[PDB]
Amino acid sequence: KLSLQDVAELIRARACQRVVVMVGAGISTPSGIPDFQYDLPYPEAIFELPFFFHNPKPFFTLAKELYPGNYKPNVTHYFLRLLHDKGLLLRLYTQNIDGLERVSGIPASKLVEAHGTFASATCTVCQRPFPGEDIRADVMADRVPRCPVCTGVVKPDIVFFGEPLPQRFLLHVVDFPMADLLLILGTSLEVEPFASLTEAVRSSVPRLLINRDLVGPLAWHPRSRDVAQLGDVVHGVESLVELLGWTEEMRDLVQRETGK
């Protein structure tokens, strides 16, 4: 039965070369963004379209808090930037909307932002697309951005409840059979379709979870080549970096990107 060091030796030895990563809220709480006053009837209303059409301000408040400049990526994000720079990253699937994967300098072509992005926006009425800078001034100024043609509300391309996942989500059809290593960081992947995706890699493919606890389909339906590195996600990432011999590259990358 496989340990963290075995996975590290697989990666070091390049016997693992096409890593598919899935990430959630647990990688972003170390940047100071919590998981899960706002003038909301219940939590989920912030991402429901009917509530939004009736009162778009609470969402726009969250958007202002999440625009670039409030948070910075942490060692977790930079570890993933490192996999990319070392030619190991096939795709990174994220449930986060903080954009820190792309901020950490992972290219868009490597990202599936499965819950969408603030980088672009769409008129809710005529479906015209707009770069997210175009509404930036309005959000920063607590104004509801309006379509310059139909007056419709222009909403950032955050996926709301009941909306299809983005088109790029389709890449899962090719990435998951192609994966030779599955890395899950900071999420349990409790809900569909993320749950079944852990089940879509080939039986011979190690699945490595760095997470608070052993939960989700790794707990429910284990396979022989699974590894759990339980506890603090930052500590787990650091142990893995440390077994890979990437300590110096972590430090180089972090100080290049963030000053120190």
Partner: peptide, 4 residues
């Protein structure tokens, strides 16, 4: 098919 796949929705949030």
């Amino acid at each position: 098919r796949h929705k949030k």
